[PDB]
Design a binder for this molecule. Structure first.
Ligand code: ZN
Ligand code: ZN
Ligand code: ZN
Ligand code: ZN
Ligand code: ZN
Ligand code: ZN
Length: 179
DNA sequence: ACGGGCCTGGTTAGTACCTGGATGGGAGACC
DNA sequence: TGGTCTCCCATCCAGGTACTAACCAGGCCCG
């Protein structure tokens, strides 16, 4: 079963490895059986391994990498990095993928991919929807701003005439008053 | 020659959304 | 059964995203 058990009353914890209890104990006490070896740092631990994992940080090492094809960006921990992959490469979730090869990426939504793909072009994604113009954009919000132009009641009198039309009442005049 | 709008390329706060980075707590493979 | 040195996860929290709404100032256009 679980021999080792908390020494304090009420806790009730119990472990099948003295060390497990031993780390739990330090919770009650507040010991630093494994402190760091550098000033400014007062970080403590309860395992000769929870100190090491902290070491690579006092420097900024990246001994672990993202087990994936395309991305080389290494990570600080394995099980940790495992996150990235699943949040990027591993399909099932990020089904839609840019198979343009080399770029090798993916997205949760189809449209999301479509956009990206444009990065392999010369044009921008979110472009102005209307005849003529053709003006394209990146940030949709910015496009929505330009839209304010093609929105009114332009008359039809050959390319010659090409004024828009704020509103019917004002649009009519353009025809009557002018034309 | 002008002044006020209408836009627009260039920027800049204002944010809800994520993402690693760093841990806390322990199973576990072996011996 | 218990050490030892490993290998995972489920999270918590600060730095960085991906855009959006709000500013700014110069180019045109027209009464
Ligand atoms: Zn306890
Ligand atoms: Zn330290
Ligand atoms: Zn990757
Ligand atoms: Zn791509
Ligand atoms: Zn347009
Ligand atoms: Zn007209």
């Amino acid at each position: 079963y679980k021999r080792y058990i908390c020494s304090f009353a009420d806790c009730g914890a119990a472990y099948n490895k003295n060390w497990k209890l031993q780390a739990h104990l330090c919770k009650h006490t507040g010991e630093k059986p494994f402190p760091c070896k550098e000033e400014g740092c007062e970080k403590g631990f309860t395992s000769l391994h929870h100190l090491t994992r902290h070491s690579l940080t006092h420097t900024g090492e990246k001994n672990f990498t993202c087990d994936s094809d395309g991305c080389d960006l290494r990570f600080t921990t394995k099980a940790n990095m495992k996150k990235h992959f699943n949040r990027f490469h591993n399909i099932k979730i990020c089904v839609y993928v840019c198979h343009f090869e080399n770029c090798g990426k993916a997205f949760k939504k189809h449209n999301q991919l479509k956009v990206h793909q444009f990065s392999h072009t010369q044009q921008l994604p979110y472009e102005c929807p209307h005849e003529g113009c053709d003006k394209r954009f990146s940030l949709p919000s910015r496009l929505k701003r330009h839209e304010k132009v093609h929105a009114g009641y332009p008359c039809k009198k050959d390319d010659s005439c090409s004024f828009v039309g704020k509103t019917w009442t004002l649009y009519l005049k353009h025809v009557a008053e002018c034309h």
